[PDB]
Amino acid sequence: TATAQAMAKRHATLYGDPAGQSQASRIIDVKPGMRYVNVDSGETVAFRAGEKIVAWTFAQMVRDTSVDLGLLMPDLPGSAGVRVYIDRSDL
């Protein structure tokens, strides 16, 4: 389990890095049934569920990619099942 959490954190690294919420350019409220969000390569986004806030800087992706928000932030309530579509990098 601790090992499964380590595995998930390693996989999550493909998609970017944790960031300070002070660094975010927007805060998205994670709501039941929201389905998905769209983010840009390199964008820093804070995700909020009540008083819990977790932020993330998306990596420069080689192609359009998507990922479950629950992989990036398992501790954020309501994150599982919300799809994150990350736009390919301009670079």
Residues that bind Cl ion (CB under 5 A): 26-27, 29, 33, 35, 37-38, 49, 53-54, 59-60, 67-68, 73, 75, 79-80
DSSP string of the chain, one letter each residue: -HHHHHHHHHHHGGGEEEE-GGG-SEEEE--TT--EEEEETT-EEEEEETTEEEEEEE---SS-EEEEHHHH-TTSTT-TT-EEEEEPP--
Query: 36 contacts which partner out of Mg ion, its own copies, Cl ion, none, CB within 5 to 8 A by kind?
Result: its own copies
Q: Give residues 18-37 in contact with its own copies (rule: CB under 8 A).
A: 25-27, 29, 31, 34-37
Q: Give residues 32-91 in contact with Mg ion (rule: CB under 5 A).
A: 87
Query: 75 contacts which partner out of Cl ion, Mg ion, its own copies, none, CB within 5 to 8 A by kind?
Result: Cl ion
